[PDB]
Write a structure and sequence with these properties.
With about 100 residues, this protein is mainly α. The protein has one domain: Cytochrome Bc1 Complex, Chain D, domain 2. It has 5 helices and no strands. Helix 3 packs across helix 5. The longest helix is centred in the C-terminal third of the chain and has 13 residues. It is globular. The structure holds heme C (HEC). Heme C binds next to helix 3. GO terms for molecular function: electron transfer activity; heme binding; metal ion binding. Keywords: Cell membrane, Electron transport, Heme, Iron, Membrane, Metal-binding, Transmembrane, Transmembrane helix, Transport.
């Protein structure tokens, strides 16, 4: 629930994601909470991501951020994961502020 702490955790995402609407290694993450999974038009998602379905609910997001390949097997997102629930919670709060 701490957006300020979440901002710091986002430092682990900035190498591939932006919050300014621009897509790069990964799709822009501004407005990602509750967003259709694989919903950014034009971004070249992996087949597993496109087949996942549903939305990026806070729960779906926290699980994915703990272990990306366990939630979306075969994803092209090469991030090891955030093992601490507090870090995931704070990051999600930060993302929610950037909706
Ligand atoms: C590059 C080395 C990455 C790092 C570090 C992080 N992410 Fe990522 N992410 C990356 C790619 C290439 C992709 C597409 C994956 C695919 O299989 O197509 C993604 C995707 C996401 C998504 C899905 C977004 C959607 O529009 O469906 C999310 C929610 C996401 N990434 C979140 C995220 C966060 C919060 C990170 C820091 C903890 C993070 N990613 C790091 C590449 C990379």
């Amino acid at each position: 629930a701490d957006p300020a702490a979440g901002e710091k955790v986002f430092g682990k995402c900035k190498a591939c994601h932006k919050l300014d609407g621009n897509d790069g290694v990964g799709p822009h993450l501004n407005g990602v909470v509750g967003r259709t999974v694989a919903g950014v038009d034009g971004f070249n998602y992996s087949d597993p991501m496109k087949a996942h379905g549903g939305d990026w609910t806070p729960e779906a997001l926290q699980e994915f951020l703990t272990n990306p390949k366990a939630v979306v097997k075969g994803t092209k997102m090469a991030f090891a994961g955030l093992p601490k629930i507090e870090d995931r919670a704070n990051l999600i709060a930060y993302l929610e502020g950037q909706q």
